[PDB]
Design an enzyme around this catalytic site. Structure first.
Site, PDB file in Angstrom:
ATOM      1  N   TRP A 167       0.841  -1.174   0.000  1.00  0.00           N
ATOM      2  CA  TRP A 167       0.000   0.000   0.000  1.00  0.00           C
ATOM      3  C   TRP A 167       0.893   1.247   0.000  1.00  0.00           C
ATOM      4  CZ3 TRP A 167       0.022  -3.428   4.496  1.00  0.00           C
ATOM      5  CH2 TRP A 167       0.371  -2.825   5.721  1.00  0.00           C
TER       6      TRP A 167
ATOM      7  N   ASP B 149       5.848  -4.636   3.326  1.00  0.00           N
ATOM      8  CA  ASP B 149       6.004  -5.469   4.496  1.00  0.00           C
ATOM      9  C   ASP B 149       7.270  -6.291   4.375  1.00  0.00           C
ATOM     10  OD1 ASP B 149       3.649  -4.579   5.702  1.00  0.00           O
ATOM     11  OD2 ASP B 149       2.440  -6.208   4.886  1.00  0.00           O
TER      12      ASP B 149
HETATM   13  N1  LIG Z   1       0.634  -3.579   6.786  1.00  0.00           N
HETATM   14  N2  LIG Z   1       0.690  -5.037   6.755  1.00  0.00           N
HETATM   15  C1  LIG Z   1      -0.452  -5.728   7.373  1.00  0.00           C
HETATM   16  C2  LIG Z   1      -1.648  -5.065   7.650  1.00  0.00           C
HETATM   17  C3  LIG Z   1      -2.729  -5.759   8.181  1.00  0.00           C
HETATM   18  C4  LIG Z   1      -2.616  -7.130   8.444  1.00  0.00           C
HETATM   19  C5  LIG Z   1      -1.419  -7.807   8.173  1.00  0.00           C
HETATM   20  C6  LIG Z   1      -0.352  -7.096   7.638  1.00  0.00           C
END
Ligand SMILES: *NNc1ccccc1
Ligand SMILES: *NNc1ccccc1
Lengths: 109, 360, 119, 360
Positions: free
Chosen positions: C49, C68
């Site tokens: 994102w 991530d």
């Molecule tokens: N931002 N990464 C994330 C967000 C929500 C759930 C798991 C990972």
């Protein structure tokens, strides 16, 4: 009173009380499997003043219940007296060894 | 900017410690937390699935874990394994298959050890019948069960021999196993009774010297196993307790509850007052420091509710652990000095270990 | 203000740090990594994102990519849930209630990074 | 002599049961569903759901459906995304249904894992990250359709007035309706006109769902509606939740599963907080507002207890609210909700609670 760590039959429980987990002292919560093996404790009955053998069969095959964690150690001994020992998972020989909760089964005097 | 992986641990090996977090509330997601003991910094982690155990290779290059998987966690086929991880990259390298009976239980050091020469991993099995499992590190193979250890528990390596270890048996004695170069039993011997199992049960955690081990009992006695000769000589009890100690019912308590500083012969022991049946796993009210040569206490300090410890012979340090927090002590003198506390190092740990330095 | 490695560690490890304005997850800089590097043995996500964050130190707005780090279990440190300009899943690449490790070789979520793309 | 037995059923009747989906975000590989009795707060049992599980109960009340991801070695090895069917009374696993490896991994909004009104098909959200809707035939135990026409859309709103129809919210600010055939394949579809401006007045995905229409609230406190009494969905809005006093204090909605509808009265329930601005759309509730959807006016407001998600039971006139850890039970038989009890410690990290279905 059965959901408290200080209830007399729970004197060698290292685990979550099954009675807080949807089961009872002698029945596994739905969908968890009894262990055929167990550690055993000898606990003092505060009513009649006699000591009783309690068999601490685990309920297995579901992830940790997480409620009513107890760590009581009356007459508990290390792994060289294996069936008096409560720092091992008594689900170790079940089809699924994941530990869910511990029961406190009265055997007798 | 560009996000990258492939990085090594940021602090050098000699700064590192390993906190084995059972995460008992969610025991299928146990893990090892890697910390810098010099500043409390979190450095990384190794996932260890259900009830992981951990040790560092004697040569300091690899982390060994032991764990259990199932194809669908709570159902499906079981796989018990040792995993080899790179210590600097904290990456998985190799899986070694075990028979489906590796010990599932709390993280006592003696459940997952290695020979002094680092060539064999030596682990406790329970089916619930007990045996010791041997893993050949070079081959990446399980060798075979040490069936001779039935009715015994835990692994105490003999630091004066390349591939020998002892275990504590139900008769109150010790069984010594000497492996051959292939990891099979080459010979064995059984000591005389060391302690009365019924009247003076010992804690399994050894205070381990190069050629002897001391053990403390539920009632605060001390027993020794001398393995300087080809056969083990046993002795004890002697008491940790003076009359004042006895009148207030001081006894030992904890899990990995003792340690030996080998150069000085100082033994460290978690103790608490008002001992009675059922208090053997109570948190430390104090740490007592015993001179094992003179058999007298030389120091006593607040225990900070500690349950487990470990000693570093090379930097003269002691770590203690209360389940969540790690205390760092300087033990270069008889009285330990508290340097710092690392808060929130784990949710449910009963074992901390240093990254090995030296030790040849 | 643009170079977290030169900044105060306590500043970058805070949920209020300006570039963390749409983070839902554990800050990688508290997990053995840095703002722009995954902790050892965790793998960057190739997708993410994106949030827009105002830098109060220099007065300008920057595009931030929230990749991530993946393939290790939850770091558990420095959990944040900031939502500036975050939108629901029908604006998918502005949305932070999904696991941006979802297409990695291993999708287990470890921690989240905040990578400065540009103005 | 007592004998330990398994095989037991949940101890309270189905009509007393609620389902708290605990993500256990700190240990997300050990997510689970906790089953509680809402009448007395008793813990009844649980279903393990591995990594980031989602859950729903079959419309007929007989089965629990879970959706989750496994890997052969959790953090490495082959991925398996699945739906599992569990018996609702025995809380036992029955069947695994294989999914393609793109099921949504994300927070537990209701609309990510739903079913047709007739209960014959499970309808779930995929993201690879390209989005599509997956259809599972329950009786066959098979993934039977992948609705690529829903690319760029998100979430599943079943139509309670048709057996196998649902809607999804698209990137154009309109709704795509899918009508499945009795084989689970798409039988027809339609697209509404633009309901809301994606850029200027984004809606929360959570529907306040009636038998033949659905209401949505926006980031700025507006209400949009989709009437599906006919085959083509008719869209309208906005009307404001806010009066002039409300606007002066910047009241806006916030939360996750943040709205609900009491179908007999038309009352819509919404979590609200003051001092709204960009970035506050997931803030805990300061208040619950009760709106008359016919008159488009507020009728009541009560303290929010920091709730984030809710659900409604029509037939017993109940609302549950959830703050992440605790579940509040409200009677909503009259316009002002009445708090009956709070179940503390129902989860560590839940954003979704659901009643056991009693309608059929
Ligand atoms: N931002 N990464 C994330 C967000 C929500 C759930 C798991 C990972
Ligand atoms: N009593 N069951 C148990 C004990 C220790 C670890 C795991 C389970």
């Amino acid at each position: 009173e059965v959901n408290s760590c200080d209830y007399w039959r729970h004197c060698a429980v290292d685990g979550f009380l099954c009675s807080c987990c949807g089961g009872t002292t002698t029945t596994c919560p739905p969908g968890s499997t009894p262990s055929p093996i167990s550690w055993i404790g000898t606990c003092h009955n505060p009513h009649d003043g006699k000591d009783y053998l309690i068999s601490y069969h685990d309920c297995c095959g579901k992830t940790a219940c997480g409620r009513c964690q107890c760590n009581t150690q009356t007459r508990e001994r290390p792994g060289y007296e294996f069936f008096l020992h409560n720092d091992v998972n008594w689900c170790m020989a079940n089809e699924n060894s994941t530990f869910h909760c511990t029961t406190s089964v009265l055997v007798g005097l | 900017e560009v996000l990258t992986g492939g990085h090594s641990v940021s602090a050098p090996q000699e700064n590192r410690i390993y906190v084995m977090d059972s995460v008992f509330m969610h025991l299928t997601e146990s893990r090892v937390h890697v910390y810098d003991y010099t500043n409390g910094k979190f450095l990384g982690m190794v996932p260890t699935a259900f009830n992981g155990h951990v040790q560092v290779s004697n040569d300091g290059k690899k982390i060994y874990t032991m764990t259990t998987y199932h194809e669908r966690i709570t159902r499906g086929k079981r796989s018990d394994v040792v995993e080899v991880w790179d210590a600097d990259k904290l990456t998985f390298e190799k899986e070694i298959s075990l028979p489906p009976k590796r010990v599932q239980g709390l993280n006592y050091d003696g459940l997952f050890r290695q020979t002094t020469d680092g060539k064999f991993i030596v682990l406790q099995n329970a089916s619930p019948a007990t045996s010791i499992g041997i893993v050949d590190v070079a081959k990446g193979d399980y060798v075979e069960d040490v069936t001779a250890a039935a009715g015994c528990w835990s692994v105490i390596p003999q630091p004066n021999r390349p591939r020998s270890f002892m275990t504590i048996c139900g008769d109150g004695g010790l069984l010594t196993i000497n492996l051959g170069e292939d990891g099979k039993v080459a010979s064995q011997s059984r000591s005389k009774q060391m302690f009365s199992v019924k009247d003076d049960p010992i804690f399994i955690a050894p205070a381990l010297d190069k050629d002897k081990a001391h053990f403390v009992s539920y009632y605060g006695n001390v027993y020794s196993a001398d393995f300087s000769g080809d056969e083990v000589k046993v002795d004890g009890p002697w008491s940790l307790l003076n009359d004042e100690d006895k009148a207030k019912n001081w006894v030992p308590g904890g899990y990995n509850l003792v340690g030996l500083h080998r150069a000085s012969g100082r033994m460290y022991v978690f103790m608490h007052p008002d001992g009675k049946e059922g208090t053997h796993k109570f948190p430390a009210a104090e740490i007592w420091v015993m001179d094992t040569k003179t058999k007298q206490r030389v120091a006593r300090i607040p225990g900070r509710d500690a349950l487990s410890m470990t000693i570093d012979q090379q930097r003269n340090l002691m770590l203690t652990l209360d389940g969540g927090n790690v205390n760092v002590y300087d033990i270069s003198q008889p009285e330990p000095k508290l340097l710092r506390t690392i808060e929130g190092a784990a949710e449910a740990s009963l074992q901390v270990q240093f990254h090995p330095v030296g030790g040849t």
